[PDB]
mmCIF file of C-alpha atoms in Angstrom:
data_model
loop_
_atom_site.group_PDB
_atom_site.id
_atom_site.type_symbol
_atom_site.label_atom_id
_atom_site.label_comp_id
_atom_site.label_asym_id
_atom_site.label_seq_id
_atom_site.Cartn_x
_atom_site.Cartn_y
_atom_site.Cartn_z
ATOM 1 C CA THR N 1 -10.503 -8.868 -14.230
ATOM 2 C CA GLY N 2 -8.515 -11.305 -16.599
ATOM 3 C CA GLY N 3 -5.731 -11.727 -13.622
ATOM 4 C CA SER N 4 -5.074 -11.624 -9.996
ATOM 5 C CA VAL N 5 -5.761 -8.272 -8.117
ATOM 6 C CA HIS N 6 -2.646 -7.901 -5.968
ATOM 7 C CA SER N 7 -2.878 -4.274 -6.641
ATOM 8 C CA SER N 8 -4.680 -2.341 -3.911
ATOM 9 C CA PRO N 9 -7.587 -0.294 -5.125
ATOM 10 C CA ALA N 10 -7.047 3.570 -5.021
ATOM 11 C CA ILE N 11 -10.338 5.742 -4.927
ATOM 12 C CA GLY N 12 -10.757 8.950 -7.018
ATOM 13 C CA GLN N 13 -12.681 12.142 -5.727
ATOM 14 C CA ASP N 14 -15.611 10.888 -7.533
ATOM 15 C CA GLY N 15 -15.533 7.448 -6.003
ATOM 16 C CA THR N 16 -13.967 5.838 -9.009
ATOM 17 C CA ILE N 17 -11.933 2.857 -8.146
ATOM 18 C CA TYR N 18 -8.569 2.416 -9.929
ATOM 19 C CA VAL N 19 -6.794 -1.053 -9.822
ATOM 20 C CA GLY N 20 -4.027 -3.048 -11.439
ATOM 21 C CA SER N 21 -4.593 -6.405 -12.563
ATOM 22 C CA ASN N 22 -1.886 -9.273 -13.606
ATOM 23 C CA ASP N 23 -3.959 -9.314 -16.837
ATOM 24 C CA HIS N 24 -1.850 -5.980 -17.672
ATOM 25 C CA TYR N 25 -4.641 -3.598 -17.290
ATOM 26 C CA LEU N 26 -5.284 -0.633 -15.198
ATOM 27 C CA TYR N 27 -9.159 -0.624 -14.305
ATOM 28 C CA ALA N 28 -11.227 2.406 -13.833
ATOM 29 C CA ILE N 29 -14.391 1.071 -12.141
ATOM 30 C CA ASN N 30 -17.506 3.324 -11.257
ATOM 31 C CA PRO N 31 -19.152 3.142 -7.653
ATOM 32 C CA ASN N 32 -22.069 1.258 -9.613
ATOM 33 C CA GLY N 33 -19.701 -1.791 -10.507
ATOM 34 C CA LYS N 34 -19.576 -0.787 -13.960
ATOM 35 C CA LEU N 35 -16.273 -0.362 -16.024
ATOM 36 C CA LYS N 36 -15.323 3.392 -16.887
ATOM 37 C CA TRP N 37 -12.218 2.347 -18.990
ATOM 38 C CA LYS N 38 -9.439 -0.001 -18.729
ATOM 39 C CA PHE N 39 -5.559 0.980 -19.827
ATOM 40 C CA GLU N 40 -3.332 -1.487 -21.459
ATOM 41 C CA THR N 41 0.061 -1.698 -20.029
ATOM 42 C CA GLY N 42 2.849 -4.090 -21.264
ATOM 43 C CA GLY N 43 3.084 -5.994 -18.018
ATOM 44 C CA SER N 44 1.382 -7.190 -14.788
ATOM 45 C CA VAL N 45 0.250 -4.284 -12.436
ATOM 46 C CA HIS N 46 0.975 -5.243 -9.207
ATOM 47 C CA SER N 47 1.403 -1.501 -7.891
ATOM 48 C CA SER N 48 -1.367 0.296 -6.332
ATOM 49 C CA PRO N 49 -2.288 3.447 -8.233
ATOM 50 C CA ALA N 50 -2.098 6.692 -6.600
ATOM 51 C CA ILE N 51 -3.924 9.742 -7.642
ATOM 52 C CA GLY N 52 -2.433 13.104 -8.055
ATOM 53 C CA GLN N 53 -4.495 16.404 -6.626
ATOM 54 C CA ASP N 54 -5.310 17.035 -10.678
ATOM 55 C CA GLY N 55 -6.972 13.428 -10.574
ATOM 56 C CA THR N 56 -4.093 11.954 -12.802
ATOM 57 C CA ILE N 57 -3.565 8.201 -12.014
ATOM 58 C CA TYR N 58 0.028 6.909 -11.256
ATOM 59 C CA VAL N 59 0.834 3.381 -11.417
ATOM 60 C CA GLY N 60 3.879 0.919 -12.229
ATOM 61 C CA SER N 61 3.934 -2.084 -14.418
ATOM 62 C CA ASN N 62 6.317 -5.174 -14.579
ATOM 63 C CA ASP N 63 6.888 -3.760 -17.887
ATOM 64 C CA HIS N 64 9.299 -1.360 -16.077
ATOM 65 C CA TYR N 65 7.412 1.984 -16.744
ATOM 66 C CA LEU N 66 5.696 4.272 -14.409
ATOM 67 C CA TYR N 67 2.326 5.254 -16.250
ATOM 68 C CA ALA N 68 0.467 8.576 -15.613
ATOM 69 C CA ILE N 69 -3.170 8.110 -17.089
ATOM 70 C CA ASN N 70 -5.556 10.764 -17.599
ATOM 71 C CA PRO N 71 -9.003 10.617 -15.459
ATOM 72 C CA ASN N 72 -10.598 9.793 -19.105
ATOM 73 C CA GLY N 73 -8.207 6.814 -19.747
ATOM 74 C CA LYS N 74 -5.911 8.302 -21.968
ATOM 75 C CA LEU N 75 -1.973 8.132 -21.382
ATOM 76 C CA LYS N 76 -0.345 11.329 -20.189
ATOM 77 C CA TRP N 77 3.122 10.063 -20.018
ATOM 78 C CA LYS N 78 5.248 6.826 -19.107
ATOM 79 C CA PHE N 79 8.542 7.045 -17.533
ATOM 80 C CA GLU N 80 11.228 4.559 -18.466
ATOM 81 C CA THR A 1 12.887 2.779 -14.649
ATOM 82 C CA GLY A 2 15.596 0.035 -14.994
ATOM 83 C CA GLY A 3 13.415 -2.515 -13.386
ATOM 84 C CA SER A 4 9.776 -3.607 -12.377
ATOM 85 C CA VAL A 5 7.708 -1.127 -10.330
ATOM 86 C CA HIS A 6 5.915 -3.217 -7.711
ATOM 87 C CA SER A 7 6.481 -0.069 -5.503
ATOM 88 C CA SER A 8 3.122 1.639 -5.313
ATOM 89 C CA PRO A 9 3.856 5.650 -6.089
ATOM 90 C CA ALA A 10 3.359 8.247 -3.388
ATOM 91 C CA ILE A 11 2.490 12.044 -4.327
ATOM 92 C CA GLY A 12 4.004 15.165 -2.833
ATOM 93 C CA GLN A 13 2.323 18.307 -1.938
ATOM 94 C CA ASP A 14 3.528 19.668 -5.179
ATOM 95 C CA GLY A 15 2.475 16.616 -7.085
ATOM 96 C CA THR A 16 5.936 15.091 -7.469
ATOM 97 C CA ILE A 17 5.478 11.149 -8.045
ATOM 98 C CA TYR A 18 8.031 9.107 -5.522
ATOM 99 C CA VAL A 19 8.389 5.331 -6.768
ATOM 100 C CA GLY A 20 10.859 2.499 -5.799
ATOM 101 C CA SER A 21 12.313 0.456 -8.676
ATOM 102 C CA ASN A 22 13.647 -3.194 -8.596
ATOM 103 C CA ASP A 23 16.799 -1.339 -10.052
ATOM 104 C CA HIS A 24 17.684 -0.186 -6.845
ATOM 105 C CA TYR A 25 16.505 3.642 -7.233
ATOM 106 C CA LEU A 26 13.790 5.775 -5.549
ATOM 107 C CA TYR A 27 12.658 8.159 -8.232
ATOM 108 C CA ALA A 28 11.231 11.629 -7.723
ATOM 109 C CA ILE A 29 9.309 12.396 -11.024
ATOM 110 C CA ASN A 30 7.451 15.861 -11.875
ATOM 111 C CA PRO A 31 4.031 16.024 -12.929
ATOM 112 C CA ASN A 32 5.337 16.681 -16.423
ATOM 113 C CA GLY A 33 6.773 13.411 -16.499
ATOM 114 C CA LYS A 34 10.646 14.528 -16.217
ATOM 115 C CA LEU A 35 12.984 13.046 -13.627
ATOM 116 C CA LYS A 36 13.478 15.403 -10.707
ATOM 117 C CA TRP A 37 16.156 12.998 -9.070
ATOM 118 C CA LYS A 38 16.760 9.349 -8.429
ATOM 119 C CA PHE A 39 18.377 8.127 -5.133
ATOM 120 C CA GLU A 40 20.495 4.954 -5.367
ATOM 121 C CA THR A 41 19.912 2.396 -2.434
ATOM 122 C CA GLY A 42 21.527 -0.927 -2.136
ATOM 123 C CA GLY A 43 18.746 -3.147 -3.176
ATOM 124 C CA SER A 44 15.314 -3.575 -4.928
ATOM 125 C CA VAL A 45 12.676 -0.695 -3.660
ATOM 126 C CA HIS A 46 9.464 -3.117 -3.312
ATOM 127 C CA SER A 47 8.373 -0.729 -0.274
ATOM 128 C CA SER A 48 5.939 2.152 -1.406
ATOM 129 C CA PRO A 49 7.533 5.505 -0.319
ATOM 130 C CA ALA A 50 5.601 7.480 2.390
ATOM 131 C CA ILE A 51 5.800 11.228 2.636
ATOM 132 C CA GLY A 52 6.246 12.980 6.226
ATOM 133 C CA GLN A 53 4.465 16.161 7.317
ATOM 134 C CA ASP A 54 8.043 18.148 6.291
ATOM 135 C CA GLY A 55 7.980 16.273 2.739
ATOM 136 C CA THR A 56 10.697 13.664 3.845
ATOM 137 C CA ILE A 57 10.307 10.597 1.778
ATOM 138 C CA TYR A 58 10.784 7.392 3.541
ATOM 139 C CA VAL A 59 11.133 3.864 1.669
ATOM 140 C CA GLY A 60 12.672 0.670 2.717
ATOM 141 C CA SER A 61 14.866 -1.410 0.524
ATOM 142 C CA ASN A 62 15.985 -5.028 0.256
ATOM 143 C CA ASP A 63 19.212 -3.880 1.210
ATOM 144 C CA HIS A 64 17.673 -4.067 4.899
ATOM 145 C CA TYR A 65 17.659 -0.132 5.561
ATOM 146 C CA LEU A 66 14.650 2.250 5.792
ATOM 147 C CA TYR A 67 15.789 5.363 3.949
ATOM 148 C CA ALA A 68 14.777 8.920 4.977
ATOM 149 C CA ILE A 69 15.359 11.130 1.912
ATOM 150 C CA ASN A 70 15.076 14.869 1.603
ATOM 151 C CA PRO A 71 12.937 16.428 -0.976
ATOM 152 C CA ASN A 72 16.011 17.498 -2.938
ATOM 153 C CA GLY A 73 16.990 13.866 -3.127
ATOM 154 C CA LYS A 74 19.858 13.961 -0.655
ATOM 155 C CA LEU A 75 20.114 11.221 2.095
ATOM 156 C CA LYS A 76 18.601 12.342 5.590
ATOM 157 C CA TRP A 77 19.589 9.110 7.327
ATOM 158 C CA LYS A 78 19.034 5.452 6.812
ATOM 159 C CA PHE A 79 18.140 3.097 9.600
ATOM 160 C CA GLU A 80 19.339 -0.686 9.806
ATOM 161 C CA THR G 1 16.487 -3.650 10.135
ATOM 162 C CA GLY G 2 17.617 -7.259 10.707
ATOM 163 C CA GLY G 3 15.594 -8.042 7.161
ATOM 164 C CA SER G 4 14.109 -6.803 3.951
ATOM 165 C CA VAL G 5 11.665 -3.699 4.525
ATOM 166 C CA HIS G 6 8.772 -4.937 1.926
ATOM 167 C CA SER G 7 6.600 -3.355 4.402
ATOM 168 C CA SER G 8 5.546 0.457 3.322
ATOM 169 C CA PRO G 9 5.989 2.997 6.029
ATOM 170 C CA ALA G 10 3.247 4.771 7.696
ATOM 171 C CA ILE G 11 3.520 8.148 9.383
ATOM 172 C CA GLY G 12 2.145 9.029 12.786
ATOM 173 C CA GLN G 13 0.544 12.491 13.689
ATOM 174 C CA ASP G 14 3.884 13.242 15.323
ATOM 175 C CA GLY G 15 5.951 12.118 12.234
ATOM 176 C CA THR G 16 6.999 8.730 13.861
ATOM 177 C CA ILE G 17 7.612 6.112 10.892
ATOM 178 C CA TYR G 18 5.941 2.816 11.446
ATOM 179 C CA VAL G 19 7.515 -0.002 9.169
ATOM 180 C CA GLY G 20 7.405 -3.960 9.209
ATOM 181 C CA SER G 21 10.798 -6.039 8.672
ATOM 182 C CA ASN G 22 11.133 -9.634 7.391
ATOM 183 C CA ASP G 23 13.128 -9.857 10.609
ATOM 184 C CA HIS G 24 9.694 -10.223 12.416
ATOM 185 C CA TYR G 25 9.541 -6.575 14.207
ATOM 186 C CA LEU G 26 7.293 -3.714 13.849
ATOM 187 C CA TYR G 27 9.665 -0.451 13.974
ATOM 188 C CA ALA G 28 8.937 2.840 15.249
ATOM 189 C CA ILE G 29 11.488 5.259 14.253
ATOM 190 C CA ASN G 30 11.488 9.023 15.311
ATOM 191 C CA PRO G 31 11.921 11.697 12.265
ATOM 192 C CA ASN G 32 15.472 12.173 13.781
ATOM 193 C CA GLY G 33 16.226 8.541 12.768
ATOM 194 C CA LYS G 34 16.588 6.988 16.266
ATOM 195 C CA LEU G 35 14.444 3.879 17.231
ATOM 196 C CA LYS G 36 11.638 4.628 19.567
ATOM 197 C CA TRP G 37 10.682 0.948 19.861
ATOM 198 C CA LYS G 38 10.394 -2.261 18.055
ATOM 199 C CA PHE G 39 7.470 -4.630 18.646
ATOM 200 C CA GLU G 40 8.540 -8.448 18.288
ATOM 201 C CA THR G 41 5.793 -10.636 15.972
ATOM 202 C CA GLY G 42 5.968 -14.306 15.237
ATOM 203 C CA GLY G 43 6.372 -13.762 11.533
ATOM 204 C CA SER G 44 7.755 -11.391 8.392
ATOM 205 C CA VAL G 45 5.669 -8.238 8.554
ATOM 206 C CA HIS G 46 5.284 -7.754 4.859
ATOM 207 C CA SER G 47 1.944 -5.834 5.599
ATOM 208 C CA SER G 48 2.184 -2.102 5.608
ATOM 209 C CA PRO G 49 1.127 -0.515 9.171
ATOM 210 C CA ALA G 50 -2.072 1.576 9.361
ATOM 211 C CA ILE G 51 -2.707 4.118 11.869
ATOM 212 C CA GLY G 52 -6.423 4.464 13.796
ATOM 213 C CA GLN G 53 -7.207 8.063 14.819
ATOM 214 C CA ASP G 54 -6.315 7.247 18.420
ATOM 215 C CA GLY G 55 -2.797 6.443 17.097
ATOM 216 C CA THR G 56 -3.190 2.641 17.470
ATOM 217 C CA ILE G 57 -0.839 0.747 14.909
ATOM 218 C CA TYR G 58 -2.424 -1.975 13.004
ATOM 219 C CA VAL G 59 -0.441 -4.699 10.983
ATOM 220 C CA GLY G 60 -0.324 -7.999 10.007
ATOM 221 C CA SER G 61 2.373 -10.738 10.121
ATOM 222 C CA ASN G 62 3.140 -14.163 8.499
ATOM 223 C CA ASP G 63 2.400 -15.562 12.025
ATOM 224 C CA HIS G 64 -1.289 -15.100 10.943
ATOM 225 C CA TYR G 65 -2.128 -12.568 13.453
ATOM 226 C CA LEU G 66 -3.406 -8.772 12.842
ATOM 227 C CA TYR G 67 -1.714 -6.677 15.601
ATOM 228 C CA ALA G 68 -3.156 -3.670 17.472
ATOM 229 C CA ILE G 69 0.090 -1.838 19.019
ATOM 230 C CA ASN G 70 -0.153 1.072 21.251
ATOM 231 C CA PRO G 71 1.861 4.220 20.326
ATOM 232 C CA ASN G 72 4.164 3.461 23.326
ATOM 233 C CA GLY G 73 5.018 -0.177 21.727
ATOM 234 C CA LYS G 74 2.788 -2.145 23.885
ATOM 235 C CA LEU G 75 0.273 -4.773 22.566
ATOM 236 C CA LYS G 76 -3.200 -3.556 22.742
ATOM 237 C CA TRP G 77 -4.501 -6.845 21.023
ATOM 238 C CA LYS G 78 -3.700 -9.607 18.359
ATOM 239 C CA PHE G 79 -6.606 -11.122 16.237
ATOM 240 C CA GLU G 80 -6.051 -14.734 14.744
ATOM 241 C CA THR L 1 -6.778 -15.192 10.842
ATOM 242 C CA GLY L 2 -6.388 -18.594 9.069
ATOM 243 C CA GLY L 3 -3.643 -17.185 6.805
ATOM 244 C CA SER L 4 -0.812 -14.677 6.275
ATOM 245 C CA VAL L 5 -1.816 -11.152 6.648
ATOM 246 C CA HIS L 6 0.278 -9.695 3.622
ATOM 247 C CA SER L 7 -2.761 -7.218 2.980
ATOM 248 C CA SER L 8 -2.018 -3.850 4.607
ATOM 249 C CA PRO L 9 -5.146 -2.672 7.051
ATOM 250 C CA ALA L 10 -7.545 0.047 6.071
ATOM 251 C CA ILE L 11 -9.109 1.891 8.812
ATOM 252 C CA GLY L 12 -13.014 3.165 8.490
ATOM 253 C CA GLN L 13 -14.354 6.614 9.757
ATOM 254 C CA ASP L 14 -15.468 4.650 13.034
ATOM 255 C CA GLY L 15 -12.169 2.913 13.507
ATOM 256 C CA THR L 16 -13.099 -0.422 12.101
ATOM 257 C CA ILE L 17 -9.969 -2.400 10.652
ATOM 258 C CA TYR L 18 -10.325 -3.914 7.180
ATOM 259 C CA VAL L 19 -7.662 -6.393 6.133
ATOM 260 C CA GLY L 20 -7.452 -9.319 3.721
ATOM 261 C CA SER L 21 -6.027 -12.733 4.465
ATOM 262 C CA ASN L 22 -4.514 -15.771 2.488
ATOM 263 C CA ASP L 23 -7.515 -17.669 4.134
ATOM 264 C CA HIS L 24 -9.778 -16.250 1.367
ATOM 265 C CA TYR L 25 -11.674 -13.781 4.021
ATOM 266 C CA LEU L 26 -11.642 -9.962 4.236
ATOM 267 C CA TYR L 27 -11.971 -9.054 8.034
ATOM 268 C CA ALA L 28 -13.834 -6.209 9.501
ATOM 269 C CA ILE L 29 -12.504 -5.833 13.110
ATOM 270 C CA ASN L 30 -13.538 -3.754 15.691
ATOM 271 C CA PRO L 31 -11.268 -1.149 17.476
ATOM 272 C CA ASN L 32 -11.787 -3.430 20.607
ATOM 273 C CA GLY L 33 -10.382 -6.487 18.535
ATOM 274 C CA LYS L 34 -13.502 -8.412 18.240
ATOM 275 C CA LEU L 35 -14.675 -9.502 14.826
ATOM 276 C CA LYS L 36 -17.211 -7.319 13.285
ATOM 277 C CA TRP L 37 -17.862 -9.821 10.150
ATOM 278 C CA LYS L 38 -15.719 -11.690 7.744
ATOM 279 C CA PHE L 39 -16.620 -11.989 4.097
ATOM 280 C CA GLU L 40 -15.689 -14.880 1.841
ATOM 281 C CA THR L 41 -13.869 -14.559 -1.339
ATOM 282 C CA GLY L 42 -12.614 -17.266 -3.723
ATOM 283 C CA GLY L 43 -8.905 -16.869 -3.393
ATOM 284 C CA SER L 44 -6.200 -15.274 -1.098
ATOM 285 C CA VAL L 45 -6.493 -11.532 -0.406
ATOM 286 C CA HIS L 46 -3.278 -9.982 -0.676
ATOM 287 C CA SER L 47 -4.639 -6.477 -1.988
ATOM 288 C CA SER L 48 -4.869 -4.051 0.857
ATOM 289 C CA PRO L 49 -8.663 -2.935 1.075
ATOM 290 C CA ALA L 50 -9.722 0.851 0.118
ATOM 291 C CA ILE L 51 -12.505 2.772 1.560
ATOM 292 C CA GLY L 52 -14.921 4.711 -0.529
ATOM 293 C CA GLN L 53 -16.638 7.994 0.734
ATOM 294 C CA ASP L 54 -19.689 6.307 1.545
ATOM 295 C CA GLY L 55 -17.762 3.606 3.432
ATOM 296 C CA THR L 56 -17.801 0.895 1.027
ATOM 297 C CA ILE L 57 -14.821 -1.533 0.939
ATOM 298 C CA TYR L 58 -12.923 -2.396 -1.995
ATOM 299 C CA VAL L 59 -10.381 -5.079 -2.311
ATOM 300 C CA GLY L 60 -9.086 -7.533 -5.189
ATOM 301 C CA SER L 61 -8.815 -11.597 -4.622
ATOM 302 C CA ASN L 62 -6.483 -13.997 -6.393
ATOM 303 C CA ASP L 63 -9.938 -15.345 -7.408
ATOM 304 C CA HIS L 64 -9.623 -12.402 -10.241
ATOM 305 C CA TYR L 65 -12.704 -10.270 -8.859
ATOM 306 C CA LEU L 66 -12.431 -6.814 -7.240
ATOM 307 C CA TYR L 67 -15.100 -6.977 -4.548
ATOM 308 C CA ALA L 68 -17.215 -3.975 -3.334
ATOM 309 C CA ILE L 69 -18.587 -4.609 0.215
ATOM 310 C CA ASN L 70 -21.150 -2.965 1.958
ATOM 311 C CA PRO L 71 -19.975 -1.763 5.536
ATOM 312 C CA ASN L 72 -22.401 -4.364 7.000
ATOM 313 C CA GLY L 73 -20.469 -7.190 5.404
ATOM 314 C CA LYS L 74 -22.817 -7.887 2.437
ATOM 315 C CA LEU L 75 -21.485 -7.769 -1.107
ATOM 316 C CA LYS L 76 -22.534 -4.849 -3.022
ATOM 317 C CA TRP L 77 -21.136 -6.091 -6.429
ATOM 318 C CA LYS L 78 -17.806 -8.023 -7.800
ATOM 319 C CA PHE L 79 -16.048 -7.187 -10.971
ATOM 320 C CA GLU L 80 -14.341 -9.763 -13.149
#
């Protein structure tokens, strides 16, 4: 990534690896090591993502929001 | 939240998202992105919550206590 | 505890809460909020404990060791 | 290890303990406390490893890469 990965990776049901970067992105990486998508936050992602039972990816940023991201990489909502 | 979310979210059995803020709150957020409740601690919550088998939410604060919070957002106990 | 809890709590099979303190202890706390035991390390425990399938508690210290602690609070081994 | 263990240990299906060190290694430790292997990264491993369903070990370094490591300690891939 463009920054330190302090974020601890979370693993989807299909083996997708979700991890925050200090570069401000949440990364979705396929088991093959190819980018699936990256989600632009406003701040460093030191928070380790969590995966809901419907596959939703939750993670906090230094931009003060908790992000809920759809498995396809589109914002579901952000909580300030 | 009112602060950085370094806290890694934990997910309840019903999909509730629990996460600490540097603003001193533990947040319970519904899958829909609406606040369920927030619990006021004395310090930054960098600790990532854990969920007991009875649904109890455990998390540490920079105020030096480990908090046990009922799913309804009321204090069960704090350990100094 | 005697310090900040940056350590994220881990939950045993019986509901025991394991958490590191910057005070240098790993704490085992019963679901009732009473101390079960505390294990003295040489350094801050920022590491979040993990629980093996046999109930062994693993956690790192700023004293440079990974600790394996028996459920009864006695050292199994430490890896430098 | 040669450094602080801020990395939270992850546990394999066979009970293998995976943990990052600030010394730049990911360590695989047998339940008996003997080194299985250590994987050399370019930076501090503060990230807590995660284990895929095929046993792959994922972890980020301060060297900016997310590492995918085979259970036998050989690099599968790294994502910058």
